Design an enzyme around this catalytic site. Structure first.
Site, PDB file in Angstrom:
ATOM      1  N   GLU A  35       0.851  -1.003  -0.048  1.00 33.96           N
ATOM      2  CA  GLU A  35      -0.241  -0.030  -0.113  1.00 33.96           C
ATOM      3  C   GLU A  35       0.973   1.158   0.091  1.00 33.96           C
ATOM      4  O   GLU A  35       0.785   2.237  -0.753  1.00 33.96           O
ATOM      5  CB  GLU A  35      -1.017  -0.040   1.027  1.00 33.96           C
ATOM      6  CG  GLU A  35      -2.066  -1.082   1.046  1.00 33.96           C
ATOM      7  CD  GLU A  35      -3.362  -0.754  -0.099  1.00 33.96           C
ATOM      8  OE1 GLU A  35      -2.877   0.368  -0.868  1.00 33.96           O
ATOM      9  OE2 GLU A  35      -4.040  -1.536  -0.274  1.00 33.96           O
ATOM     10  N   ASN A  46      -7.226   8.686  -6.118  1.00 30.21           N
ATOM     11  CA  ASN A  46      -8.153   7.752  -6.913  1.00 30.21           C
ATOM     12  C   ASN A  46      -8.877   8.272  -8.012  1.00 30.21           C
ATOM     13  O   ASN A  46      -9.104   9.788  -7.972  1.00 30.21           O
ATOM     14  CB  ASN A  46      -9.282   6.865  -5.790  1.00 30.21           C
ATOM     15  CG  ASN A  46      -8.247   6.057  -4.634  1.00 30.21           C
ATOM     16  OD1 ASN A  46      -7.445   5.540  -4.890  1.00 30.21           O
ATOM     17  ND2 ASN A  46      -8.742   6.686  -3.355  1.00 30.21           N
ATOM     18  N   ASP A  48     -11.983   8.325  -8.744  1.00 31.90           N
ATOM     19  CA  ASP A  48     -13.125   8.821  -8.399  1.00 31.90           C
ATOM     20  C   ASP A  48     -12.962  10.309  -7.515  1.00 31.90           C
ATOM     21  O   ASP A  48     -13.829  10.678  -7.076  1.00 31.90           O
ATOM     22  CB  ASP A  48     -13.953   7.793  -7.620  1.00 31.90           C
ATOM     23  CG  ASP A  48     -13.351   7.805  -6.071  1.00 31.90           C
ATOM     24  OD1 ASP A  48     -12.309   8.267  -5.745  1.00 31.90           O
ATOM     25  OD2 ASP A  48     -13.865   6.822  -5.532  1.00 31.90           O
ATOM     26  N   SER A  50     -11.325  10.545  -4.868  1.00 32.58           N
ATOM     27  CA  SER A  50     -11.179  10.369  -3.236  1.00 32.58           C
ATOM     28  C   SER A  50      -9.612  10.312  -3.342  1.00 32.58           C
ATOM     29  O   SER A  50      -8.950  10.099  -4.295  1.00 32.58           O
ATOM     30  CB  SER A  50     -11.565   9.107  -2.828  1.00 32.58           C
ATOM     31  OG  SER A  50     -11.249   7.942  -3.513  1.00 32.58           O
ATOM     32  N   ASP A  52      -6.199   8.188  -0.876  1.00 30.13           N
ATOM     33  CA  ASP A  52      -5.980   7.169  -0.045  1.00 30.13           C
ATOM     34  C   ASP A  52      -4.579   7.786   0.997  1.00 30.13           C
ATOM     35  O   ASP A  52      -3.595   8.361   0.135  1.00 30.13           O
ATOM     36  CB  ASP A  52      -5.232   5.976  -0.570  1.00 30.13           C
ATOM     37  CG  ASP A  52      -6.451   4.990  -1.217  1.00 30.13           C
ATOM     38  OD1 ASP A  52      -7.715   5.276  -1.263  1.00 30.13           O
ATOM     39  OD2 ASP A  52      -6.108   3.740  -1.891  1.00 30.13           O
ATOM     40  N   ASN A  59      -8.918   5.396   2.520  1.00 26.74           N
ATOM     41  CA  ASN A  59      -9.667   6.240   1.672  1.00 26.74           C
ATOM     42  C   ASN A  59     -10.673   7.090   2.258  1.00 26.74           C
ATOM     43  O   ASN A  59     -11.521   6.982   3.077  1.00 26.74           O
ATOM     44  CB  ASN A  59     -10.204   5.202   0.642  1.00 26.74           C
ATOM     45  CG  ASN A  59     -10.786   5.828  -0.508  1.00 26.74           C
ATOM     46  OD1 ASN A  59     -10.619   6.719  -0.993  1.00 26.74           O
ATOM     47  ND2 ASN A  59     -11.601   4.941  -1.357  1.00 26.74           N
TER      48      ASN A  59
END
Ligand SMILES: [Cl-]
Ligand SMILES: [Cl-]
Ligand SMILES: [Cl-]
Ligand code: NA
Ligand SMILES: [Pt+2]
Length: 129
Positions: A35, A46, A48, A50, A52, A59
């Site tokens: 990660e 991301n 969309d 969003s 992380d 997220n």
């Protein structure tokens, strides 16, 4: 902070991740590796819109507030910047909520594609735990 592998294992253990919801410590270490490469400051945007955040790439769609994810929730009731601290407490507490939520560690896409079913114990091999 960029944790060492055994250093991170120890912090995760101390904060009660080892076997949390049945996931052994090496699962969590392996998830962190892929990660964030053990970097508490890691951020990734991301598709969309969003983002992380942190060692476990939590997220903003659902878990933390960053002020810039329309429609999102903040189910860990924290600013997303708290997930970037050198202290992993907020990350671990939020992870615990995430992994309790029905899909277990599959919520971490890198866990599912890179850790799940592999020899995760290798991630804690040689650590004094
Ligand atoms: Cl393990
Ligand atoms: Cl928001
Ligand atoms: Cl599960
Ligand atoms: Na949010
Ligand atoms: Pt803790």
């Amino acid at each position: 902070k960029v944790f060492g592998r055994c250093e991170l294992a120890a912090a995760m253990k101390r904060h009660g991740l080892d076997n949390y919801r049945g996931y052994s410590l090496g699962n969590w270490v392996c998830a962190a590796k892929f990660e964030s490469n053990f970097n508490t400051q890691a951020t990734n945007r991301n598709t969309d819109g969003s983002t992380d955040y942190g060692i476990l790439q939590i997220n903003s769609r659902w878990w933390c507030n960053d002020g810039r994810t329309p429609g999102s929730r903040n189910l860990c009731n924290i600013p997303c910047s708290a997930l970037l601290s050198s202290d992993i407490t907020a990350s671990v507490n939020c992870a615990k909520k995430i992994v309790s939520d029905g899909n277990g560690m599959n919520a971490w896409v890198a866990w599912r594609n890179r850790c799940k079913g592999t020899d995760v114990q290798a991630w804690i091999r040689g650590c004094r735990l």
